[PDB]
PDB file of C-alpha atoms and ligand atoms in Angstrom:
ATOM      1  CA  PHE A   1       0.000   0.000   0.000  1.00  0.00           C
ATOM      2  CA  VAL A   2       1.115   3.511  -0.961  1.00  0.00           C
ATOM      3  CA  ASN A   3       0.571   4.846   2.583  1.00  0.00           C
ATOM      4  CA  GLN A   4       3.629   7.081   2.395  1.00  0.00           C
ATOM      5  CA  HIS A   5       2.587   8.473  -0.968  1.00  0.00           C
ATOM      6  CA  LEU A   6      -0.859   9.330   0.393  1.00  0.00           C
ATOM      7  CA  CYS A   7       0.520  10.676   3.672  1.00  0.00           C
ATOM      8  CA  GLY A   8       2.847  13.053   1.796  1.00  0.00           C
ATOM      9  CA  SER A   9      -0.051  14.574  -0.129  1.00  0.00           C
ATOM     10  CA  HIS A  10      -1.675  15.537   3.185  1.00  0.00           C
ATOM     11  CA  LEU A  11       1.623  16.791   4.546  1.00  0.00           C
ATOM     12  CA  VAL A  12       2.215  19.252   1.706  1.00  0.00           C
ATOM     13  CA  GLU A  13      -1.349  20.605   2.005  1.00  0.00           C
ATOM     14  CA  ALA A  14      -0.786  21.110   5.754  1.00  0.00           C
ATOM     15  CA  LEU A  15       2.533  22.894   5.195  1.00  0.00           C
ATOM     16  CA  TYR A  16       0.783  25.128   2.672  1.00  0.00           C
ATOM     17  CA  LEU A  17      -1.567  26.293   5.429  1.00  0.00           C
ATOM     18  CA  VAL A  18       0.994  26.302   8.225  1.00  0.00           C
ATOM     19  CA  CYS A  19       3.799  28.023   6.321  1.00  0.00           C
ATOM     20  CA  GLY A  20       1.762  30.622   4.434  1.00  0.00           C
ATOM     21  CA  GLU A  21       3.870  33.346   2.801  1.00  0.00           C
ATOM     22  CA  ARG A  22       7.041  31.726   4.169  1.00  0.00           C
ATOM     23  CA  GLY A  23       6.685  28.855   1.714  1.00  0.00           C
ATOM     24  CA  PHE A  24       8.446  25.511   2.039  1.00  0.00           C
ATOM     25  CA  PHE A  25      10.590  22.904   0.342  1.00  0.00           C
ATOM     26  CA  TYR A  26       9.353  19.343  -0.051  1.00  0.00           C
ATOM     27  CA  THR A  27      12.071  16.721  -0.481  1.00  0.00           C
ATOM     28  CA  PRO A  28      10.979  13.041  -0.313  1.00  0.00           C
ATOM     29  CA  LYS A  29      14.495  12.411   1.026  1.00  0.00           C
ATOM     30  CA  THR A  30      17.376  14.683   2.111  1.00  0.00           C
TER      31      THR A  30
ATOM     32  CA  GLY B   1      12.839  13.830   7.946  1.00  0.00           C
ATOM     33  CA  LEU B   2       9.358  15.166   7.122  1.00  0.00           C
ATOM     34  CA  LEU B   3       7.868  11.936   5.764  1.00  0.00           C
ATOM     35  CA  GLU B   4       9.597   9.574   8.201  1.00  0.00           C
ATOM     36  CA  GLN B   5       8.750  11.895  11.100  1.00  0.00           C
ATOM     37  CA  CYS B   6       5.175  12.902  10.225  1.00  0.00           C
ATOM     38  CA  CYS B   7       3.832   9.724   8.603  1.00  0.00           C
ATOM     39  CA  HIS B   8       4.625   7.295  11.415  1.00  0.00           C
ATOM     40  CA  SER B   9       3.381   9.766  14.040  1.00  0.00           C
ATOM     41  CA  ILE B  10       0.985  12.747  14.058  1.00  0.00           C
ATOM     42  CA  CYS B  11       2.700  16.111  13.625  1.00  0.00           C
ATOM     43  CA  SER B  12       0.577  18.964  14.950  1.00  0.00           C
ATOM     44  CA  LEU B  13       0.571  22.377  13.288  1.00  0.00           C
ATOM     45  CA  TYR B  14       3.306  23.404  15.730  1.00  0.00           C
ATOM     46  CA  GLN B  15       5.472  20.435  14.760  1.00  0.00           C
ATOM     47  CA  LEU B  16       4.945  21.178  11.054  1.00  0.00           C
ATOM     48  CA  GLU B  17       6.223  24.767  11.314  1.00  0.00           C
ATOM     49  CA  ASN B  18       9.734  23.416  11.769  1.00  0.00           C
ATOM     50  CA  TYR B  19       9.560  22.499   8.079  1.00  0.00           C
ATOM     51  CA  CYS B  20       8.664  26.033   6.941  1.00  0.00           C
ATOM     52  CA  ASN B  21      10.745  29.122   6.147  1.00  0.00           C
TER      53      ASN B  21
ATOM     54  CA  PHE C   1      -0.331  30.387   9.411  1.00  0.00           C
ATOM     55  CA  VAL C   2      -1.537  31.183   5.891  1.00  0.00           C
ATOM     56  CA  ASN C   3      -2.997  34.642   5.310  1.00  0.00           C
ATOM     57  CA  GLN C   4      -5.797  34.037   2.804  1.00  0.00           C
ATOM     58  CA  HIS C   5      -9.551  33.495   2.529  1.00  0.00           C
ATOM     59  CA  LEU C   6     -10.580  29.962   3.517  1.00  0.00           C
ATOM     60  CA  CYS C   7     -13.827  28.662   2.028  1.00  0.00           C
ATOM     61  CA  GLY C   8     -15.789  25.490   1.428  1.00  0.00           C
ATOM     62  CA  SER C   9     -13.827  22.365   2.203  1.00  0.00           C
ATOM     63  CA  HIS C  10     -10.558  24.315   2.594  1.00  0.00           C
ATOM     64  CA  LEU C  11     -11.943  25.960   5.716  1.00  0.00           C
ATOM     65  CA  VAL C  12     -12.954  22.531   7.039  1.00  0.00           C
ATOM     66  CA  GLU C  13      -9.489  21.078   6.439  1.00  0.00           C
ATOM     67  CA  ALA C  14      -7.941  24.138   8.105  1.00  0.00           C
ATOM     68  CA  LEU C  15     -10.078  23.570  11.219  1.00  0.00           C
ATOM     69  CA  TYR C  16      -9.196  19.863  11.194  1.00  0.00           C
ATOM     70  CA  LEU C  17      -5.501  20.804  11.145  1.00  0.00           C
ATOM     71  CA  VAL C  18      -5.598  23.756  13.553  1.00  0.00           C
ATOM     72  CA  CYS C  19      -7.804  22.023  16.105  1.00  0.00           C
ATOM     73  CA  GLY C  20      -6.023  18.678  16.370  1.00  0.00           C
ATOM     74  CA  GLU C  21      -7.367  16.381  19.080  1.00  0.00           C
ATOM     75  CA  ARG C  22      -9.688  19.164  20.246  1.00  0.00           C
ATOM     76  CA  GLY C  23     -11.938  18.476  17.301  1.00  0.00           C
ATOM     77  CA  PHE C  24     -14.152  21.276  16.005  1.00  0.00           C
ATOM     78  CA  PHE C  25     -17.639  22.369  15.082  1.00  0.00           C
ATOM     79  CA  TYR C  26     -18.596  23.524  11.618  1.00  0.00           C
ATOM     80  CA  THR C  27     -21.913  25.326  11.247  1.00  0.00           C
ATOM     81  CA  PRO C  28     -21.959  27.393   7.982  1.00  0.00           C
ATOM     82  CA  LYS C  29     -25.490  28.629   8.670  1.00  0.00           C
ATOM     83  CA  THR C  30     -25.522  28.805  12.476  1.00  0.00           C
TER      84      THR C  30
ATOM     85  CA  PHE D   1       1.251   4.831  10.301  1.00  0.00           C
ATOM     86  CA  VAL D   2      -1.144   7.740  10.844  1.00  0.00           C
ATOM     87  CA  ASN D   3      -3.996   5.967   9.009  1.00  0.00           C
ATOM     88  CA  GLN D   4      -6.604   7.300  11.418  1.00  0.00           C
ATOM     89  CA  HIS D   5      -5.282  10.836  11.121  1.00  0.00           C
ATOM     90  CA  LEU D   6      -5.476  10.649   7.328  1.00  0.00           C
ATOM     91  CA  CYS D   7      -8.865   8.922   7.358  1.00  0.00           C
ATOM     92  CA  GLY D   8     -10.331  11.688   9.546  1.00  0.00           C
ATOM     93  CA  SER D   9      -9.283  14.374   7.075  1.00  0.00           C
ATOM     94  CA  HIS D  10     -11.343  12.624   4.384  1.00  0.00           C
ATOM     95  CA  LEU D  11     -14.227  12.129   6.780  1.00  0.00           C
ATOM     96  CA  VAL D  12     -14.573  15.825   7.617  1.00  0.00           C
ATOM     97  CA  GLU D  13     -14.466  16.773   3.913  1.00  0.00           C
ATOM     98  CA  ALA D  14     -17.225  14.214   3.232  1.00  0.00           C
ATOM     99  CA  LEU D  15     -19.381  15.515   6.090  1.00  0.00           C
ATOM    100  CA  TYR D  16     -18.912  19.020   4.705  1.00  0.00           C
ATOM    101  CA  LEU D  17     -20.536  17.883   1.457  1.00  0.00           C
ATOM    102  CA  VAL D  18     -23.088  15.558   3.022  1.00  0.00           C
ATOM    103  CA  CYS D  19     -24.230  17.879   5.809  1.00  0.00           C
ATOM    104  CA  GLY D  20     -24.297  21.162   3.889  1.00  0.00           C
ATOM    105  CA  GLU D  21     -26.079  23.987   5.727  1.00  0.00           C
ATOM    106  CA  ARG D  22     -26.827  21.636   8.637  1.00  0.00           C
ATOM    107  CA  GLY D  23     -23.171  21.665   9.656  1.00  0.00           C
ATOM    108  CA  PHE D  24     -21.550  19.106  11.937  1.00  0.00           C
ATOM    109  CA  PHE D  25     -19.421  18.522  15.003  1.00  0.00           C
ATOM    110  CA  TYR D  26     -16.154  16.616  14.752  1.00  0.00           C
ATOM    111  CA  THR D  27     -14.959  15.016  17.986  1.00  0.00           C
ATOM    112  CA  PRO D  28     -11.985  12.597  17.732  1.00  0.00           C
ATOM    113  CA  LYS D  29     -13.560  10.880  20.753  1.00  0.00           C
ATOM    114  CA  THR D  30     -16.877  11.289  22.617  1.00  0.00           C
TER     115      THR D  30
ATOM    116  CA  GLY E   1     -18.049   6.698  16.880  1.00  0.00           C
ATOM    117  CA  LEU E   2     -17.303   8.479  13.586  1.00  0.00           C
ATOM    118  CA  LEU E   3     -13.623   7.539  13.308  1.00  0.00           C
ATOM    119  CA  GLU E   4     -13.941   4.019  14.727  1.00  0.00           C
ATOM    120  CA  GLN E   5     -17.025   3.398  12.582  1.00  0.00           C
ATOM    121  CA  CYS E   6     -15.976   5.013   9.287  1.00  0.00           C
ATOM    122  CA  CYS E   7     -12.232   4.294   9.211  1.00  0.00           C
ATOM    123  CA  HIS E   8     -12.386   0.526   9.665  1.00  0.00           C
ATOM    124  CA  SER E   9     -15.280   0.243   7.196  1.00  0.00           C
ATOM    125  CA  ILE E  10     -16.610   2.361   4.304  1.00  0.00           C
ATOM    126  CA  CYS E  11     -19.421   4.724   5.283  1.00  0.00           C
ATOM    127  CA  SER E  12     -21.520   5.746   2.291  1.00  0.00           C
ATOM    128  CA  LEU E  13     -23.035   9.217   2.018  1.00  0.00           C
ATOM    129  CA  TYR E  14     -26.185   7.804   3.624  1.00  0.00           C
ATOM    130  CA  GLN E  15     -24.224   6.433   6.578  1.00  0.00           C
ATOM    131  CA  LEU E  16     -22.413   9.766   7.005  1.00  0.00           C
ATOM    132  CA  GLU E  17     -25.637  11.787   7.326  1.00  0.00           C
ATOM    133  CA  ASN E  18     -26.168  10.273  10.760  1.00  0.00           C
ATOM    134  CA  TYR E  19     -23.281  12.487  11.877  1.00  0.00           C
ATOM    135  CA  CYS E  20     -24.873  15.713  10.595  1.00  0.00           C
ATOM    136  CA  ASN E  21     -27.403  18.142  12.081  1.00  0.00           C
TER     137      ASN E  21
ATOM    138  CA  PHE F   1     -26.289  17.416   0.540  1.00  0.00           C
ATOM    139  CA  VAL F   2     -24.383  20.698   0.270  1.00  0.00           C
ATOM    140  CA  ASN F   3     -26.045  23.501  -1.684  1.00  0.00           C
ATOM    141  CA  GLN F   4     -23.143  25.241  -3.425  1.00  0.00           C
ATOM    142  CA  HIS F   5     -21.250  25.413  -6.719  1.00  0.00           C
ATOM    143  CA  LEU F   6     -18.885  22.462  -7.185  1.00  0.00           C
ATOM    144  CA  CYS F   7     -15.912  23.020  -9.486  1.00  0.00           C
ATOM    145  CA  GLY F   8     -12.549  21.583 -10.436  1.00  0.00           C
ATOM    146  CA  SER F   9     -11.422  18.808  -8.147  1.00  0.00           C
ATOM    147  CA  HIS F  10     -14.236  19.501  -5.649  1.00  0.00           C
ATOM    148  CA  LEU F  11     -16.767  18.318  -8.212  1.00  0.00           C
ATOM    149  CA  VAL F  12     -14.680  15.181  -8.782  1.00  0.00           C
ATOM    150  CA  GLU F  13     -14.504  14.403  -5.062  1.00  0.00           C
ATOM    151  CA  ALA F  14     -18.260  14.994  -4.783  1.00  0.00           C
ATOM    152  CA  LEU F  15     -18.905  12.447  -7.554  1.00  0.00           C
ATOM    153  CA  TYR F  16     -16.501   9.992  -5.908  1.00  0.00           C
ATOM    154  CA  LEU F  17     -18.474  10.328  -2.662  1.00  0.00           C
ATOM    155  CA  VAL F  18     -21.999  10.425  -4.107  1.00  0.00           C
ATOM    156  CA  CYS F  19     -21.441   7.555  -6.522  1.00  0.00           C
ATOM    157  CA  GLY F  20     -19.792   5.039  -4.204  1.00  0.00           C
ATOM    158  CA  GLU F  21     -19.222   1.611  -5.738  1.00  0.00           C
ATOM    159  CA  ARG F  22     -21.106   2.726  -8.853  1.00  0.00           C
ATOM    160  CA  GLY F  23     -18.082   4.698  -9.935  1.00  0.00           C
ATOM    161  CA  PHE F  24     -18.578   7.679 -12.235  1.00  0.00           C
ATOM    162  CA  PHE F  25     -17.594   9.377 -15.453  1.00  0.00           C
ATOM    163  CA  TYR F  26     -16.071  12.829 -15.588  1.00  0.00           C
ATOM    164  CA  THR F  27     -15.987  14.555 -18.965  1.00  0.00           C
ATOM    165  CA  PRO F  28     -15.570  18.370 -18.511  1.00  0.00           C
ATOM    166  CA  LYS F  29     -15.616  18.945 -22.270  1.00  0.00           C
ATOM    167  CA  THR F  30     -17.957  16.180 -23.449  1.00  0.00           C
TER     168      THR F  30
ATOM    169  CA  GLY G   1     -22.469  19.408 -19.544  1.00  0.00           C
ATOM    170  CA  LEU G   2     -21.635  18.282 -16.011  1.00  0.00           C
ATOM    171  CA  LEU G   3     -19.208  21.148 -15.505  1.00  0.00           C
ATOM    172  CA  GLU G   4     -21.705  23.524 -17.034  1.00  0.00           C
ATOM    173  CA  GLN G   5     -24.450  22.598 -14.521  1.00  0.00           C
ATOM    174  CA  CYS G   6     -22.889  21.691 -11.182  1.00  0.00           C
ATOM    175  CA  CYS G   7     -20.071  24.230 -11.256  1.00  0.00           C
ATOM    176  CA  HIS G   8     -21.754  27.199 -12.965  1.00  0.00           C
ATOM    177  CA  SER G   9     -25.162  26.294 -11.533  1.00  0.00           C
ATOM    178  CA  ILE G  10     -26.122  24.318  -8.424  1.00  0.00           C
ATOM    179  CA  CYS G  11     -26.793  20.575  -8.532  1.00  0.00           C
ATOM    180  CA  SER G  12     -29.033  18.639  -6.188  1.00  0.00           C
ATOM    181  CA  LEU G  13     -27.691  15.277  -5.028  1.00  0.00           C
ATOM    182  CA  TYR G  14     -30.123  13.901  -7.616  1.00  0.00           C
ATOM    183  CA  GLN G  15     -28.590  15.818 -10.522  1.00  0.00           C
ATOM    184  CA  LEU G  16     -25.164  14.717  -9.284  1.00  0.00           C
ATOM    185  CA  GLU G  17     -26.155  11.060  -9.503  1.00  0.00           C
ATOM    186  CA  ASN G  18     -26.775  11.505 -13.236  1.00  0.00           C
ATOM    187  CA  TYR G  19     -23.015  11.145 -13.608  1.00  0.00           C
ATOM    188  CA  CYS G  20     -22.630   7.866 -11.702  1.00  0.00           C
ATOM    189  CA  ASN G  21     -22.107   4.712 -13.788  1.00  0.00           C
TER     190      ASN G  21
ATOM    191  CA  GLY H   1     -20.551  33.324  11.530  1.00  0.00           C
ATOM    192  CA  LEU H   2     -17.465  31.207  10.864  1.00  0.00           C
ATOM    193  CA  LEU H   3     -18.098  31.182   7.127  1.00  0.00           C
ATOM    194  CA  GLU H   4     -18.831  34.879   7.234  1.00  0.00           C
ATOM    195  CA  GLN H   5     -15.438  35.727   8.806  1.00  0.00           C
ATOM    196  CA  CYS H   6     -12.810  33.264   7.607  1.00  0.00           C
ATOM    197  CA  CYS H   7     -14.095  32.870   4.059  1.00  0.00           C
ATOM    198  CA  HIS H   8     -15.335  36.397   3.293  1.00  0.00           C
ATOM    199  CA  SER H   9     -12.712  37.980   5.552  1.00  0.00           C
ATOM    200  CA  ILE H  10      -9.312  36.714   6.702  1.00  0.00           C
ATOM    201  CA  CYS H  11      -8.859  34.803   9.960  1.00  0.00           C
ATOM    202  CA  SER H  12      -5.718  34.665  12.051  1.00  0.00           C
ATOM    203  CA  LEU H  13      -4.835  31.252  13.474  1.00  0.00           C
ATOM    204  CA  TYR H  14      -6.262  32.706  16.693  1.00  0.00           C
ATOM    205  CA  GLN H  15      -9.674  33.471  15.193  1.00  0.00           C
ATOM    206  CA  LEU H  16      -9.649  29.986  13.664  1.00  0.00           C
ATOM    207  CA  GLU H  17      -9.194  28.388  17.075  1.00  0.00           C
ATOM    208  CA  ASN H  18     -12.485  29.952  18.190  1.00  0.00           C
ATOM    209  CA  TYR H  19     -14.139  27.060  16.374  1.00  0.00           C
ATOM    210  CA  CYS H  20     -12.228  24.234  18.076  1.00  0.00           C
ATOM    211  CA  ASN H  21     -14.092  22.270  20.767  1.00  0.00           C
TER     212      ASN H  21
ATOM    213  CA  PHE I   1      -8.738   0.055   7.392  1.00  0.00           C
ATOM    214  CA  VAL I   2     -10.324   1.728   4.363  1.00  0.00           C
ATOM    215  CA  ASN I   3      -6.944   2.208   2.636  1.00  0.00           C
ATOM    216  CA  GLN I   4      -8.394   1.467  -0.789  1.00  0.00           C
ATOM    217  CA  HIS I   5     -11.270   3.871  -0.252  1.00  0.00           C
ATOM    218  CA  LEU I   6      -8.848   6.638   0.715  1.00  0.00           C
ATOM    219  CA  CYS I   7      -6.399   5.781  -2.066  1.00  0.00           C
ATOM    220  CA  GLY I   8      -9.173   6.038  -4.680  1.00  0.00           C
ATOM    221  CA  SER I   9     -10.061   9.562  -3.576  1.00  0.00           C
ATOM    222  CA  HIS I  10      -6.478  10.638  -4.323  1.00  0.00           C
ATOM    223  CA  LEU I  11      -6.491   8.745  -7.596  1.00  0.00           C
ATOM    224  CA  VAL I  12      -9.551  10.534  -8.978  1.00  0.00           C
ATOM    225  CA  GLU I  13      -8.117  13.944  -8.006  1.00  0.00           C
ATOM    226  CA  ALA I  14      -4.870  13.033  -9.811  1.00  0.00           C
ATOM    227  CA  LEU I  15      -6.722  11.892 -12.938  1.00  0.00           C
ATOM    228  CA  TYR I  16      -8.635  15.172 -12.872  1.00  0.00           C
ATOM    229  CA  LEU I  17      -5.329  17.031 -13.185  1.00  0.00           C
ATOM    230  CA  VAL I  18      -3.639  14.553 -15.503  1.00  0.00           C
ATOM    231  CA  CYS I  19      -6.554  14.043 -17.891  1.00  0.00           C
ATOM    232  CA  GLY I  20      -7.803  17.629 -18.118  1.00  0.00           C
ATOM    233  CA  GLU I  21     -10.301  18.216 -20.936  1.00  0.00           C
ATOM    234  CA  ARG I  22     -10.021  14.553 -21.962  1.00  0.00           C
ATOM    235  CA  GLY I  23     -11.940  13.493 -18.863  1.00  0.00           C
ATOM    236  CA  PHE I  24     -11.984   9.973 -17.455  1.00  0.00           C
ATOM    237  CA  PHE I  25     -14.108   7.095 -16.239  1.00  0.00           C
ATOM    238  CA  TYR I  26     -13.735   5.776 -12.706  1.00  0.00           C
ATOM    239  CA  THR I  27     -14.884   2.191 -12.184  1.00  0.00           C
ATOM    240  CA  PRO I  28     -14.031   0.567  -8.807  1.00  0.00           C
ATOM    241  CA  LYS I  29     -13.983  -2.701 -10.775  1.00  0.00           C
ATOM    242  CA  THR I  30     -14.190  -3.569 -14.497  1.00  0.00           C
TER     243      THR I  30
ATOM    244  CA  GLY J   1      -7.072  -2.101 -12.901  1.00  0.00           C
ATOM    245  CA  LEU J   2      -6.712   1.484 -11.638  1.00  0.00           C
ATOM    246  CA  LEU J   3      -7.175   0.778  -7.925  1.00  0.00           C
ATOM    247  CA  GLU J   4      -5.324  -2.551  -7.858  1.00  0.00           C
ATOM    248  CA  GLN J   5      -2.519  -1.070  -9.966  1.00  0.00           C
ATOM    249  CA  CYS J   6      -2.145   2.383  -8.384  1.00  0.00           C
ATOM    250  CA  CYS J   7      -2.909   1.661  -4.719  1.00  0.00           C
ATOM    251  CA  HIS J   8      -0.372  -1.111  -4.164  1.00  0.00           C
ATOM    252  CA  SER J   9       2.308   0.818  -6.074  1.00  0.00           C
ATOM    253  CA  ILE J  10       2.927   4.492  -6.936  1.00  0.00           C
ATOM    254  CA  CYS J  11       1.633   5.517 -10.359  1.00  0.00           C
ATOM    255  CA  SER J  12       3.383   8.620 -11.665  1.00  0.00           C
ATOM    256  CA  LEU J  13       1.552  11.202 -13.761  1.00  0.00           C
ATOM    257  CA  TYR J  14       2.765   9.334 -16.850  1.00  0.00           C
ATOM    258  CA  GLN J  15       1.340   6.045 -15.585  1.00  0.00           C
ATOM    259  CA  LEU J  16      -1.984   7.729 -14.758  1.00  0.00           C
ATOM    260  CA  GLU J  17      -2.498   9.065 -18.299  1.00  0.00           C
ATOM    261  CA  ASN J  18      -3.212   5.529 -19.460  1.00  0.00           C
ATOM    262  CA  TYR J  19      -6.506   5.876 -17.588  1.00  0.00           C
ATOM    263  CA  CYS J  20      -7.543   9.070 -19.408  1.00  0.00           C
ATOM    264  CA  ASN J  21      -9.281   9.729 -22.731  1.00  0.00           C
TER     265      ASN J  21
ATOM    266  CA  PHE K   1      -2.406  17.905 -18.167  1.00  0.00           C
ATOM    267  CA  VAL K   2      -5.319  20.076 -17.038  1.00  0.00           C
ATOM    268  CA  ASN K   3      -5.630  23.510 -18.634  1.00  0.00           C
ATOM    269  CA  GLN K   4      -6.914  25.713 -15.809  1.00  0.00           C
ATOM    270  CA  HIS K   5      -5.788  28.160 -13.124  1.00  0.00           C
ATOM    271  CA  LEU K   6      -4.206  26.403 -10.136  1.00  0.00           C
ATOM    272  CA  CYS K   7      -4.327  28.257  -6.820  1.00  0.00           C
ATOM    273  CA  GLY K   8      -3.921  27.765  -3.096  1.00  0.00           C
ATOM    274  CA  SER K   9      -3.637  24.139  -2.103  1.00  0.00           C
ATOM    275  CA  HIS K  10      -4.600  22.933  -5.604  1.00  0.00           C
ATOM    276  CA  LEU K  11      -1.339  24.319  -6.951  1.00  0.00           C
ATOM    277  CA  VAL K  12       0.539  22.543  -4.150  1.00  0.00           C
ATOM    278  CA  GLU K  13      -1.131  19.208  -4.900  1.00  0.00           C
ATOM    279  CA  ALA K  14      -0.387  19.694  -8.607  1.00  0.00           C
ATOM    280  CA  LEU K  15       3.319  20.196  -7.837  1.00  0.00           C
ATOM    281  CA  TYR K  16       3.291  17.158  -5.538  1.00  0.00           C
ATOM    282  CA  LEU K  17       1.852  15.084  -8.395  1.00  0.00           C
ATOM    283  CA  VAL K  18       3.881  16.535 -11.276  1.00  0.00           C
ATOM    284  CA  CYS K  19       7.185  16.458  -9.419  1.00  0.00           C
ATOM    285  CA  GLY K  20       7.078  12.935  -8.005  1.00  0.00           C
ATOM    286  CA  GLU K  21      10.271  11.829  -6.271  1.00  0.00           C
ATOM    287  CA  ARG K  22      11.950  15.067  -7.362  1.00  0.00           C
ATOM    288  CA  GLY K  23      10.068  16.911  -4.667  1.00  0.00           C
ATOM    289  CA  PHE K  24       9.415  20.625  -5.115  1.00  0.00           C
ATOM    290  CA  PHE K  25       9.707  24.079  -3.635  1.00  0.00           C
ATOM    291  CA  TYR K  26       6.727  26.290  -2.940  1.00  0.00           C
ATOM    292  CA  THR K  27       7.412  29.958  -2.258  1.00  0.00           C
ATOM    293  CA  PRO K  28       4.217  32.051  -2.844  1.00  0.00           C
ATOM    294  CA  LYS K  29       6.010  35.273  -1.917  1.00  0.00           C
ATOM    295  CA  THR K  30       9.549  34.571  -3.142  1.00  0.00           C
TER     296      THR K  30
ATOM    297  CA  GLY L   1       6.520  34.083  -9.192  1.00  0.00           C
ATOM    298  CA  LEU L   2       4.979  30.608  -9.198  1.00  0.00           C
ATOM    299  CA  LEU L   3       1.729  31.879  -7.719  1.00  0.00           C
ATOM    300  CA  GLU L   4       1.779  34.784 -10.122  1.00  0.00           C
ATOM    301  CA  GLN L   5       1.963  32.512 -13.206  1.00  0.00           C
ATOM    302  CA  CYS L   6       0.118  29.265 -12.526  1.00  0.00           C
ATOM    303  CA  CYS L   7      -2.694  30.730 -10.443  1.00  0.00           C
ATOM    304  CA  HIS L   8      -3.261  34.088 -12.165  1.00  0.00           C
ATOM    305  CA  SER L   9      -2.225  32.703 -15.555  1.00  0.00           C
ATOM    306  CA  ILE L  10      -2.259  29.150 -16.919  1.00  0.00           C
ATOM    307  CA  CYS L  11       0.772  26.863 -16.687  1.00  0.00           C
ATOM    308  CA  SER L  12       1.612  24.021 -19.029  1.00  0.00           C
ATOM    309  CA  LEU L  13       2.907  20.853 -17.375  1.00  0.00           C
ATOM    310  CA  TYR L  14       6.289  22.125 -18.581  1.00  0.00           C
ATOM    311  CA  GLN L  15       6.044  25.439 -16.728  1.00  0.00           C
ATOM    312  CA  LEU L  16       4.904  23.501 -13.659  1.00  0.00           C
ATOM    313  CA  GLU L  17       8.051  21.381 -13.710  1.00  0.00           C
ATOM    314  CA  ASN L  18      10.129  24.548 -13.296  1.00  0.00           C
ATOM    315  CA  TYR L  19       9.270  24.281  -9.609  1.00  0.00           C
ATOM    316  CA  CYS L  20      10.410  20.681  -9.083  1.00  0.00           C
ATOM    317  CA  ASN L  21      13.742  20.175  -7.292  1.00  0.00           C
TER     318      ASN L  21
HETATM  319 CL1  LIG M 101     -11.348  26.625  -4.750  1.00  0.00          CL
HETATM  320 CL1  LIG M 102      -5.040   8.810   2.839  1.00  0.00          CL
HETATM  321 ZN1  LIG M 103     -10.665  24.646  -3.895  1.00  0.00          ZN
HETATM  322 ZN1  LIG M 104      -5.738  10.781   1.999  1.00  0.00          ZN
END
């Protein structure tokens, strides 16, 4: 099951709200 | 990091901020 | 936190995130 | 895995559509 | 309740209405 | 059910929810 | 037009079901 | 009105918390 | 756990973006 | 098909196109 | 790919999808 | 400006990839 793939989708949406104008970098690794 | 940390355990809004800026 | 208008389901997801374990109440008509 | 955390996010979005003007209360417990 | 009931088994739109109003 | 305009991906999620096992067809241009 | 009616106009749950298989 | 303030106007994280249980 | 139910929700949103004007058919089976 | 194929393994945007048109 | 305006969290999900393993950077203010 | 181009204007999948790492 692609649990991690699905979890990441939620994570980026949450960072979008949490970070706001500050933005963020999403790196599936380092 | 982000995935390892926040997918195996619930990161609140406060814990997620560490991945901003 | 983000600084933009939150509507429809985006407001609901924001509450879900912001409120955590506390849970929340959504009443668009009150 | 945060399956329950992810499931709840979908649940609130579904209630948003299903409940409409009636609104709803989300309580991770009682 | 909601989580226990609808996360371990698929709640249709009809089953979700019970959690409205 | 909700009483508002459904567009983009929100219309797709609504169909996904409303249709259940039946599945659905989405053709924005037809 | 699905998009024409449910996005530009409002669709009852009934009208929405017209697009289920 | 939650919808009236956070959707038609902007809500700080503080104002948003007014709707948590 | 409703993993498949949750996965499908993401899938239809992705097809919405990927397919665009071409649209798509979602059938939980054949 | 779609579910079996893309839920037990990550389908990229390119792999998802096969389910369009 | 879809041919419409992508804003807020929909732009973030699009990047998540389009970028895959590559990951992405979201900076709304730059 | 990502937001300036893909949200206020339309972005091809190509333009979108300009924001991948
Ligand atoms: Cl929107
Ligand atoms: Cl999920
Ligand atoms: Zn939206
Ligand atoms: Zn999900």
